[PDB]
Each structure stands twice: as structure tokens, then as C-alpha cells.
């Protein structure tokens, strides 16, 4: 039994399943998905926060942007929907007409994901389950359906872990003023006792109805409610020990940390479990303005996951569905392409551990990432070298045998000084897809 | 940007407008205005608090007095309205039948007021705006009108600053026992988390709907809610920097202090901005039992404002309207009379600063008050001397020229020892009204 | 960098070296070592606490015991040393005349310990290093030597890790009344701010002077100083990230938990790192009353270690030296015994991880424990079976091969139903020492 | 009387004398003044903090620097003084052989300073008065003199106000590890209750012995002592109401805020009193490596002061004396320069208030600043224009007359559109020194 205190909850470490899953699908879907619109300005960590909230590239932030008059979103809204059309009104057009959960889970399984996390309530405070705590949810409005639940059955049928995203820190149903600058976030929050009780009841509800594998909170937890978390975590873990919890509660406990786009990205191995999060494009919620110029390429996705994994993390890729319940093809294409590379190279990703170091580079700088599996050292090149002679800078293998991962073919190598040279026959190099993968056994 | 912490809110000082306004109208109007009744016992600071709540001379306290059986109010109520008539029932007779806000603002402008503050919710918890937090408000009951709002438009059209009074500390809708002695106030309060949230939401609502120039709280703020105030003040000031806030919250911040009847009245210059408050009569809410024997005279009003002003304060005079929305003539007379003296002598009051000292007295003790305006020193006599030779005790003017304020007429004066003698020709003395005003230029 | 807050320190998990060490030596050595006397009552968890402190079997508790008049220790003292003989007088008799730190480290290395932790200050508050915060230390009294530092140099040259034990929660130099019942521990403590600073300054000083590998606190941390630990842990981890901290501070953070004698002993796999501690006998400090009847036997030491290791823990075995600095022969014998067994079987102990289950037993009740090392599963019998037929209950191996560990000889086995039967040829059975160890590869 | 609580202390606003003084002298003088060495890296706000403490340009940080092995300061020390030479050894070389406090005060008076504030104790914890709480002070070591008191007597006889600087947040006598990165400041501090008492007792003692006009704390106040400040401020203000306090205590109360070099510098009118501080050069303590290339020029000092004053602030210019007590010539020259300009233009600086705006510029980009004194508006050009035609952008004066300040000569001007043009006859332009100053009366 876990007890309701930080010292006792320290005992709960991140579950083996999570540590091994390596790749998950985040899903930001809500009434904001309907206008599904945002100025695709850039990447968090790259856009000056002085203008960010006024040129918000995150479509889930539509209501906050709409509250800022004379903001691209405001202009777009009045021209498209009209001045008199309140944000909340989108819960009526959000009908998920063409939603098939089994199709999503199927697609996430094909894409190589091992877990899925949908936004159950994002900052606009609209809920995608039949909460008994508010009438602004998907059962009484829009869809008339318990999306969280039906999706949880599907992802589970597909044999995938299911977690929940929940906006503990922000709920615009409790405020009127929009966020215009980062500092605003320190005072424009629900602030009441009532809201702290609401968050607590709602996450308890998610724990009772769905017993998720992950509690992924966002934007901190209401100060007046931080202490409830001792009770909620004990309760949760006691019902579900292999459950997990992220680091965005603003309290002493968490099972794994998080890093967003540029924000918090580790340069080398950190000493704890973490998860990198990002959209395929610049937004989490669907943005009709994003085209391929904005999205990552399959090649880029793979390089990303491999880098995140060689560093001890998991990659939580976000997809942003449309109001009708369909997943844009630009995003479906890319999921399938990552999926495909994972079918071929899964074994060097899933279930792996960090090695002595994460990184290395060749003589002409192709970047190299490492992962472990007991005595087997996977060597992953972000790309496929042209030459057959290959020179890895600063590295000596103690191992006796290096093998070409996809074929098995033993390879010739020798510690040439402070480096290691290996010879890969073009017939092999020609077989790899996106990444030349070697396998060393010391 | 102001931040949600006491140290950062320290930066907000009392707005220039307030410091210069000098005189404001407080308005205590509510369902208590209908019985409009109280035993006119005396002045706060003069009535022994051992009997005060049982002989309450403040008519807005009607419900508290009514809850004390065998109390003059209780007797009067059962004879006039009946045992079976609950206090709350007055919200049905409170119909403001004859209310014209434009007429009030007009009258307050003529009376010389620069700002106005109506009680939006007094201790009986009835609200004079359409709050969404309670059904006991003027839109759903009584008037069927948003009094706060309609009055805010009017006072603003009249070009006057508008603030709000709000009973943060007491709300009898959350208690059943009456206050019988001062000590009772330490435990008979709403006390719940819910009430702290209610106050916070309601003042936020007043800030959102009306963005007042002044947040005038009363009776302290619910202990469980004091910390919200960091957030509310930052929020408020950030929306309205020239906004102001009084000192009755029981937290580290405030823009100006307060003093009631005898309670907290400074003897000389204090080193911060404050505001003296009092009714024209002994009550704030309308009291049909008060006659002129109870009210201040125009002469007394003027002497009061001048004394309060020479000491750095503002005078917040309270008027108590009737249930029909009309302002008793006894009170209208006096407002107009103060107004009249302000038309003549405004320039020695509005926009002034304290001088080296506030006070002085003549040889035969007519009291004298001082105000400044750069190098111009206004010298105000509380009354008009008969003689022409005048002797001001303990004072030497360094200034070269003294002038009779109303005419301009240079006057003859000399430092005669530790005193100053001046000669005012009766033709001049005969021109002043209520106060002989001199003007010195050093 | 770690930051001074529980959330950030959570980032620091137990160092890999500690997780893999499995076996460490504790050393209770102090002026109490001189009288080196205690009644061998029994084991913590088995002696009713109503009598425990009056028949204290822990000899380091001599001063507490002496403070209880008419207690075995009091009588013993009066008779052997006299009434005029204060406990602190032992600091001068504690001369460590025959102490050779390098012999100790040689000794601890032979026995198999991978780390050593001496008491730098026990409840009697005597310090075994030249602290600058007290004169009651080994540099100024007795030994005229920095025991801690001199021992650190030696252990480190033997290639073993060094940690320190510090009695943060109790210090008899700051109290007068002895502990008679467990409940006394709740109010009889130093209690002052001055004591909290002292404790703070002393651990800071140990960090600064010897940068220990483990900070082993005991009896909790002074309530007034609990918040100092955020700073101290951050200070310590930023200077020594591979450093570690136990769980006896009473704050949200720890790297490994502790169990003592019967107290807090897990029956199956917990999910965090812990360490078990006990003496070779019933006391931690030297007890000249203890005979082999009170000590564990090499066989019991071995079974203790295996049991602890199969459950994720480390065993911290305590050694109680004499005031002259020699390690009593009954204890030296036993270390050597354990050390010999480790020489033969250590590869199935050091560097291992837990398996799916920790335990199993033979049809005839010999106890079995498991440990893992990748694909290799070590099956350690707590003793050596007689028959060649071996039936382990409730167990089926999927593994293709099962080898007899010490020789490597493949063995025959088959999953006979819900059990597993293996045949161990007497020649092999006769080869093992104390424990029959098998190796299975899946 | 002030009461010991933030709400009541709010009553104390910044004293009129301080608001009107505008210019003050800071004096960093200590044993660090002896080595008087530092690498002139640059200005705070412009040197990346990742390197800052290893190339510290603030010479008073010598001990911190010395504590970092292989740091310019460490090398410099070892080479010049030796390894066996501890920093505290400088207390004995700090003999102030040529110190004449009255020459200093004469000097500060000529330069224009209206108040002086010497460091009574800097981060190295050496005290420049005969404190009774430490032996590390100027009465017992070095100077054998009460520097603080002797300097207070002199400054006060010169008719200037006296304040004290006290390093409440840092004291290296209580720590061992140096600050290497800004984040260290969060855990490397005295941290003990004993230190909080000490700090408390030492400021109490400065109040008691010299009743300073300003209490200038630095680096925040020990967390354990924050609540002591309610008592101390109340104690101080009740003994000296015209006393004042800066904003580096980290509690709800302060009389004026502070900005340092680039750090916290306002671009336009804030709405509270603040003070700007910087050295004549890059360091506060004497740096014998600094040459004119590192110092501001009299012209830059003047523009600095005008800019600060037009924005509501005071400039606290720092002077760094030598261990013998003489003020280096490059700095004396500059004070005198500033002092001469103040002799001519001071009436447009001392006693002024801010105007509606602080700034404006000429069509040709010469910067302009404004200051007020009732109806008089001073227009200070940061330099002297060449043409006689002067076009100030975005500005219209309602004022009837515009005079050339130093002479009084009426000038011609007209609001040519959105600008204002004035003609300054070269004879006048040639009369001004460093800044063309005009005077406008409305
Ligand atoms: O859209 C949400 C937001 O991007 C947060 C991160 C964030 C950080 C700073 C400003 C806005 C948003 N990550 C989770 C997303 O669901
Ligand atoms: O009627 C209210 C009450 O007089 C408070 C002052 C007060 C003080 C002590 C007892 C009762 C009331 N001032 C504001 C008025 O609206
Ligand atoms: O003597 C110390 C005591 O055993 C603590 C545990 C303890 C618990 C309860 C009573 C006495 C002791 N563990 C370490 C030993 O050094
Ligand atoms: O050396 C002191 C330091 O400049 C503080 C400000 C400061 C801030 C950050 C690092 C070092 C110093 N201001 C007063 C000076 O005496």
C-alpha cells in the first residue's frame, strides 16, 4: 500500500511498460478542432513570447486567441462565423460525424505506438467524457457520446496502453480575460477553492471510470489543490500500481519528466525517465493552415524518435483530428511511414536502454545514436552513408563482433586510433531504409 | 505589469485623480432603505458598544437589529409589517419606482462631488446588479434593474469617477445569529470556503462588468480568501492602473486608509492618503426618524471637508436614498449648500496639498486650516471674523504678499512677534460666505 | 544542476554502483565501545518495547541505559567503574591503541563488502573526526586521531566506497532524561534551533571534508531543520552526483529505504531500492556478553544476504570493534566466512537484478531464491539438498537450458506439471558450499 | 507609531528628502580593496552569466573568485601573494593609513551627492564598525578604527544624509563553496537560524549605533529571518520616521526599488520611487585594472543622472576607494566633473518631479529628458545642438514662454504641426556645458 504522503509515494517508480514503450500518440481533439485554425508562426522555443499569444500557432488555443480582439484569430472568426458566434457554440458543431475509434487504434497500432493519450479536457474546459461535474461535455452537447470511453475500449482492444490528458492548470470556463503575455499566467487562472475541488473530482472520475495507464496533467495544479494530490496519487496507484504520472503538477512527485518542442530538450543522457512531446506540425490541435512545409518528414520523425530514445526518453507524437472525427492524410501518411520503419527496426528501439553514451558522429559527420539490450549495442546512423568505408569519430569497440542489423552479415572493423572503421558493402547499405543500423556484441 | 504578490503591488500608489478629488458621495441604498428605520442614538465613537447593536442607529443594520428580539427595531417591525414578514421580503417592495440616475449624478455633480460610490452589496447580502452568483439581487427581485450599472453610466456621463462598495466581511445570507456585541464579530461570519469563493467571484464580476475607479471593501475579507486578493488586485490594476483600493481587506496592500465618524480621525497630518467617511445624519441608510437635529449643517459640512482636506484626506459623504429612489430633501438641501460653497472656494480645495502644518487659531480662537498649491498658501478660517484686525497665533509668514481670496485684494499684514496680524476690510469680510479665505504667496 | 526543492531532487535516483554493490559493512565504533557491555536480550521486533530500553541489547545505547538507575547497565557500571564515573569519561579511555585502518579495509575487502560506513556520531554525540563544532571528538579526546578521515583514505585505497552514518535525530549531549519507552522519542530530543543548525553544519562539514558516497542519517532529522535538507541534498548532489542518501530524514526525498532486524522487512519484491541492516550479533556496538549463541553463523549470514538480494536489497552488515580498535574474533571469523562464499558465488549476487519472483521452495521445503543478470537466472538454494532428484514447487522454466553454476555442467530437467524437476549428480551437490546454486538461461 | 506588520508599515512612504535628493554616493570599501584586482569583463546585463562568476569584473567579489581554482583571480592571487595566503589575511593589510573621513565628505559634497552610503559589511562578512557580534571587523583588525561611525560623523557635519549598506543575503564567513553559476545562489547561503539572528542583531546594532537615513540591504534577507523585518522596520521607523529602506529584503515592504547597470532599468516613468546604481567603472570595489576605457566620462555620468532623474529615480553613484583610504584619481576627476555640472544645472535636478513624459528627441536624434518644478518644465538635451534651429519631434507646448535656462533669455518657438521648433542663438548654445537646458512655463 502507498500512503498519502510524498515520502511514501517516492516508492512508486515509472512502470516497466512505460520505460519500454518508447513511442506514444498524443491526441488533441476538441471543439477547437472545428474552427481548426491558427497562424502557423513557429516552434515553441523559437517564437518570441512577446508576440506568441497574439500570433498563437497552437490551434487548441483558439478561444484564448479569440478573446484577444484584433488578433488574426479574431479577424478570421468574425469573417467566417460572425461576431455573435461564441466559442462555446462550437460544442454544437462538434459532431464527430465520421468518427470510428477502432480505426484510430488500428492506425496508431500500425504507426508503431504502444500507448495513446487523448485530451480529456483542454484549457477551454470542454470534456470528452460524460463527467457529472459539468454540462459542457461531449455527452450532452456535440457528439452525444463518451469519446474518452469509447476510445479507451478501442485502444485497449488494439492491445495498447491508454492514458489521459487533463488541463489541471487552466480552464477558461473559470476566467474571462485572455492570456496576452507569459506573466499573465501567474494570475489569470481559476483561483478558487471550488475549481481545485472540480479538478480533483474530475481526475478522480477519470481514475474511477477508466483507470488510465497515465495521468498526464498540464499547466500545473491549482495551488489550493496541490495537497489533494497526495491522496489522489495514493488512491490511483493503489488501484493501479503500474499506472504512471507526469511532471506537470507542481508537487514533489512524478514518474517521468516532460520536454516540449525546444523546451527542456536534453543534450545527453539525463538520470531519469522523460518524454518529448510535439505535433507532427506546429500545432497540437488541427490547423487547416498547415501544409507539409510545416510538418516533419518521416525521415525527420525517425531521426527524432531515435534521438529521443538513445537518450532515455519516450516520444509522445501528437495528432490533431478534425471536428468530424477523421485524421488528416498529411498526418496519417507520416504515422504510417514511421510505423513502417519501426516494423523493420523495432528491435533496436522498443525495450532498449541507454548505453554508456548516446551519441557519436562520423568523419564527415553523419550523426550516430546508440541503444542497448544487454550485451547487444545497436548503432543507428541518422541517414545512410554513401561510402562503404565508415569512420566513427572518438570510439573504440571492445566487442568481438559487429553485424549489419538488417541482414545479420558479420562486418569487418578495427579500432583505428581513437576511432573505429567499419566496412559496409553497398549491397547492405542499399537495403537499409532511412537509417544504417549496425549491431555490436561485446 | 503588476504581479500577484504584495511586494510587487507595493508599486501601485494612490492615483493622482483620487488624491486630488477631495470630495466624494457614498450611497447606502438597499432593501433596508424600505423600512428605512432606526433609533437615532448617536455617533460611532460616542455610543457605548455595550448597547450599540441593541439601539443601532445605522438603518442599513435593520436585519441584524430585527434578529434581536425585543429590540426597538423588532418592536417597530412587528407593529408596522408583522411578525410573519421576513426581512428578505423587502426585496419585493424595493421597487425604485421613482429612480432617475441622471438626476442623482446631476445632483452629486452640483454638490461638488468628484466621485461616487454606491453600496453594491451590504451586509444583508442583497445585490444591486445582476450578479450571476445569487438570485437575491435587484434584477430578479425588487427593481428588476441593474442599479449599479445604470448608476455607473450616469455618474460617468456626468463626468464623475465611479467606485463600488462591497461587504466582503459580512453577508447575513450566510448566518442566522445576530451581532449583539463587538466580540461577536470574531466568530459570526460566513466562515466557509464557499463564501470566500463567492466574495472573490463577485468582486471579479464587479471588476469585469464595471471596471470601477475604487474598490471599497468593508468589514475585512474572509480569512480563507485573503490570498486571492494578490490575484484580484493584480488583475484589477492590470486592467485599470488608475484604479484604487481601500484599507479594509485585512491584507498588506491598500491605496488609502479610512476613518469613520470619530473612529480613526487624525489630529494632524498623517503620512499617507486617507478618506473620512460619515453620513449627513447619524445613519448611512435612510432613517425616517432623523430630522435636522441629527444632520450636519452646511456650515458644519464645509468645516468638516476643509478640516479633512487640510490634513491630506478626502471626505466621503454618505447619502441614504429612499426605497422609491428619491433623495430626502434634508439631504438634498445640504448637498446643494456644500456644492455652493465649493463653486466659490473650490480652487482652495480641489487639487491641493498639505502645507507644513494643517492648523492654526486666532487670538480669540477662530480655527484656521491650511492648503497648498505650489507657492500659493490658502488660509481658511472656519467662520468669518467680526473685527478687521485679525491675530493668528504662532505663525510668521515669510511670503511677500497676502491676498483676500474672493476679491484678489492685496492686504496689509506683518509678523508681530510669534504671531501674524492682518487687516481685513469689512467690505471683504462681508463678501465671504461661511469661511474667510486668505491667499498667501511666499 | 539539482535545485533545492523536492521536485527537482526527485531527479536523483539511487546510483548504479550502490544498486549493484549488494554488500556493505556498517561500523558502530565509539566511546561506548569501551565499556562494550549490554544484556543480550534479543532481536528488534521480538523484544516487547515495554521492557526494551531497560534491557537494551544494543551496546551503543550504554549512556541511555546508564541514565536509568537500577537497570542492568546501571548496576554493571557502578560495580565495574563506580558512581563517580560519568559516561563522557570514556572518551579518554577510548584510545584505539591497536587500530590499523588499512587492516580493516583489507578485512572488509576480503569479506566481500563493496562499501563501508562508520558511525561518525552516534546518539551519545561523540564525533569521530575533528569537527569544528564540538570539542567532544576523537581529535581532542581519546584517539587523538581523525578516525573518519583516516578510515576513508584506507577504504578508498582498497577500492571500496565510503559513506558516513550520522545520528541526526538523537544527541544525548543535548538532553538529560533517558528514553524509557518508545513514546519518549516523541518529546525527548534536542528540540532547539541551535541543535538543528549544529546537525546541519556537521553533515555539511562531513560533505566538505570527505564527500561521502552515502549519507546515512538516523532517528530522523530535527523538525526545525527538515527544510535545510533541500539545500544540503542539492549541495551534496551537485558536488557528488553518484552520492546517495538513506530514508531516515523524515522528508520527501531518499535514494534507498532501510529495514532493521525484523523491522520493515519485505516478504516479497518491493518496487524501490532498500538496504537491510543488522549486527553479526544482537548489538551494533561491541558487546563483550555476546557469544556464538547470539551471533549468526556463516550459513545464516549467507542465507540472509541471498534473501536480501533476491528482493532488490543490499545487506549492510554491522561490525562492532573494541575500544583498542581490534575487531573481535567471533566477528572476523564470520566476515571471512561470508567472504569465502562470495568468492565462489559472487557472480550470482553482485550486479544482479530481481527476477519475476524472489522465492520458491522444494517439495521437501528447502528455500529457494532467484536473481537475474540479463538472460541468466540464478537459482540459489538455501542449503544443499541430499537426494539428486529435486522438486521445486509451483514453477515451470521456459528456458532451454539449466546448468549447475559452480561447474557449468548442463543438467536435466523437465516441467513435470505445475512443478519443475532437476537432477543434480551428487558429485556436483558435493561441490557446492552452503548453497546449491543453479543457472538457467531462457 | 508603526506596528510590526506589513499593513501598518505600508503607512511609511519614502521620505521627502530622499525623493528630492536625486544624487547619492555609494562606497564599496573593504579588505578586498587591498588586492583591489578584477578582470574588466563588462557590464551586468551584458556578460553571459555562464561565464560571469569565473571572469567576475566586480572586484569586491575577490574571495568568491579566489575560491574558484584556475580562475583569473586564483592565478593572479597565487602569483602575487601566494597559495599560503588566505583571503582573511587581507584584513590585516587593510590599514587605511591615509584615510581622512572629512576629505571624503568634502569631496562628496563638491560632487553634488546629497547622501552617502558605505558598505558596512559585504559578502566577505568583514565589518567596518566595531560590531559586538564578530571579531572580523575594522576595530579589531586592520584600521583599528570604527570606519562606519567615523564616516557618519563627517558626512553628517558636511550636512549630507548617511545610510548603510549591509549584505544580509550573503556572508562568505558562513559558506565554503563559491558561487559558480546564478543557480548556486539558491542553495549556497548561510542557511542557519544562527545566521538569521546574526543578521538581525547586526542591522539592529547599526540602527542603535548610527540611526542611518537609509537601510540598504543586499542579496535578499535570510528566509528564516524574513518575519524579523516587521519588528525591525517598526523599530527603525519609530526611532527615525524620515528613515528609509530599499527593496532587496524580499518582503512585502520597501520605500524605493533598485536597478543595477542594465538590470531592472525602466525605459519610461514607473509609478514608484527607485534608485539606479552603478560604478564609475565596471566594478564596485577598487579595480586597479580599470582604465579610462572602462569608466564613464563626465558627459556620460551627466546623461546617466539626467536620464535617471527624468524617470523618477535617484542615481546612487559608486566610488571604490583603495586600502590606504584614498580615492583613485580617475574617479575623483569624474565626481568633480559631475559636481561642476550640478553647480550650474542643479536647480533643474534637485527637488524636481517627473513630467507627463520623460523623453523626446530632436529631428536629428539628440535625446531630450524632462523634469518638473510646479509650472516650470526643464527640457534637458543630452548634449548641445549645433544649428540654432531645433526641431523636437512629437511635442507641442501649451506654455506661453520658453526660456534658455542658464541665462533666462526668452526664446522663440512655435508648434509647427506635431513638433515644436525653438531657436537657440549660438551665443547661448555656446554658454551651456555638456547639456543644452531650456525652461518652459505653462
Ligand atoms: O497546447 C498545449 C500547450 O502547447 C502546452 C505547452 C505550452 C507552453 C507554453 C505556452 C502554451 C503552451 N503543451 C501541451 C499542449 O496541449
Ligand atoms: O453601515 C456600515 C458601518 O457603519 C461601517 C462601520 C461600522 C463599525 C462598527 C460597527 C458597525 C459598523 N461603515 C460602513 C457602513 O456602511
Ligand atoms: O543504535 C542505532 C539504532 O539501532 C537504530 C534503530 C533504533 C530504533 C529503535 C530503538 C533503538 C534504535 N539503528 C541504528 C543503530 O545504530
Ligand atoms: O557586489 C554587489 C553586487 O553587485 C550586487 C548585485 C549582484 C547581483 C548578481 C551578482 C553579483 C552582484 N549589487 C551590490 C554590489 O555591492
Automatic annotation (TrEMBL), chains A, B, C, D:
Superkingdom of the source species: Bacteria
GO BP field: fucose metabolic process; glycoside catabolic process
Listed GO MF terms: alpha-L-fucosidase activity
Cysteines paired by S-S bonds: 358-359
Function of the molecule: Alpha-L-fucosidase is responsible for hydrolyzing the alpha-1,6-linked fucose joined to the reducing-end N-acetylglucosamine of the carbohydrate moieties of glycoproteins.
Domain Glycoside hydrolase family 29 N-terminal per the UniProt entry, residue ranges: 1-347
Pfam families per record: Alpha_L_fucos (PF01120)
Enzyme class, UniProt record, top EC level: hydrolase
Keywords of the record: Glycosidase, Hydrolase, Signal
Positions where N6-carboxylysine occurs in the chain: 332
Similarity field: Belongs to the glycosyl hydrolase 29 family.
Gene Ontology terms: cellular component: lysosome
The protein's name in its UniProt record: alpha-L-fucosidase
Enzyme Commission number(s): 3.2.1.51
Organism: Thermotoga maritima (strain ATCC 43589 / DSM 3109 / JCM 10099 / NBRC 100826 / MSB8)
PANTHER family: ALPHA-L-FUCOSIDASE, ALPHA-L-FUCOSIDASE-RELATED
Amino acid at each position: 500500500r502507498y500512503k498519502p504522503d510524498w515520502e511514501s509515494l517516492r516508492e512508486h517508480t515509472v512502470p516497466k511498460w512505460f520505460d519500454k514503450a518508447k513511442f506514444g500518440i498524443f491526441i488533441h481533439w476538441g471543439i477547437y478542432s472545428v474552427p481548426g485554425w491558427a497562424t502557423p508562426t513557429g516552434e515553441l522555443g523559437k517564437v518570441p513570447m512577446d508576440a506568441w499569444f497574439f500570433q498563437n500557432p497552437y490551434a487548441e488555443w483558439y478561444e484564448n486567441s479569440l478573446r484577444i480582439k484584433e488578433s488574426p484569430t479574431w479577424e478570421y472568426h468574425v469573417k467566417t462565423y460572425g461576431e455573435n458566434f461564441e466559442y462555446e457554440k462550437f460544442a454544437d458543431l462538434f459532431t464527430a460525424e465520421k468518427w470510428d475509434p477502432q480505426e484510430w487504434a488500428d492506425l496508431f497500432k500500425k504507426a508503431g505506438a504502444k500507448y495513446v493519450i487523448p485530451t480529456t479536457k483542454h484549457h477551454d474546459g470542454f470534456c470528452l467524457w460524460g463527467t457529472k461535474y459539468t454540462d459542457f461535455n461531449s455527452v450532452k452537447r456535440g457528439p452525444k457520446r463518451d469519446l474518452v470511453g469509447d476510445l479507451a475500449k478501442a485502444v485497449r482492444e488494439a492491445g495498447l496502453r491508454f492514458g489521459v490528458y487533463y488541463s489541471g492548470g487552466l480552464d477558461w470556463r473559470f476566467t474571462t480575460e485572455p492570456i496576452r503575455y507569459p506573466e499573465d499566467l501567474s494570475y489569470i487562472r481559476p483561483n478558487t477553492y471550488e475549481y481545485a475541488d472540480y479538478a480533483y473530482k474530475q481526475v478522480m472520475e477519470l481514475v474511477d471510470l477508466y483507470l488510465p495507464d497515465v495521468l498526464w496533467n498540464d499547466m500545473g495544479w491549482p495551488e489550493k489543490g496541490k495537497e489533494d494530490l497526495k491522496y489522489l496519487f495514493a488512491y490511483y496507484y493503489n488501484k493501479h500500481p503500474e499506472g504512471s504520472v507526469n511532471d506537470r503538477w507542481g508537487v514533489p512527485h512524478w514518474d517521468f519528466k516532460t520536454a516540449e518542442y525546444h523546451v527542456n530538450y536534453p543534450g545527453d543522457l539525463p538520470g531519469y525517465k522523460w518524454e518529448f512531446t510535439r505535433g507532427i506540425g506546429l500545432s497540437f490541435g488541427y490547423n487547416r493552415n498547415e501544409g507539409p512545409e510545416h510538418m516533419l518528414s518521416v525521415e525527420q520523425l525517425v531521426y527524432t524518435l531515435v534521438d529521443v530514445v538513445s537518450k532515455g526518453g519516450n516520444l509522445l507524437l501528437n495528432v490533431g483530428p478534425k471536428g468530424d472525427g477523421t485524421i488528416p492524410d498529411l498526418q496519417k501518411e507520416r504515422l504510417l511511414g514511421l510505423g513502417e520503419w519501426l516494423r523493420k527496426y523495432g528491435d533496436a528501439i522498443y525495450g532498449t536502454s541507454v548505453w554508456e553514451r548516446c551519441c557519436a558522429k562520423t568523419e564527415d559527420g553523419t550523426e550516430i545514436r546508440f541503444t542497448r539490450k544487454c550485451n547487444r549495442i545497436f548503432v543507428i546512423f541518422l541517414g545512410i552513408p554513401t561510402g562503404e568505408k565508415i569512420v566513427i569519430e572518438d570510439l573504440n569497440l571492445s566487442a568481438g563482433t559487429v553485424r549489419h542489423f538488417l541482414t545479420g552479415e558479420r562486418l569487418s572493423f578495427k579500432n583505428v586510433g581513437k576511432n573505429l572503421e567499419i566496412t559496409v558493402p553497398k549491397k547492405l547499405l542499399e537495403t537499409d531504409s532511412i537509417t544504417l543500423v549496425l549491431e555490436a556484441v561485446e
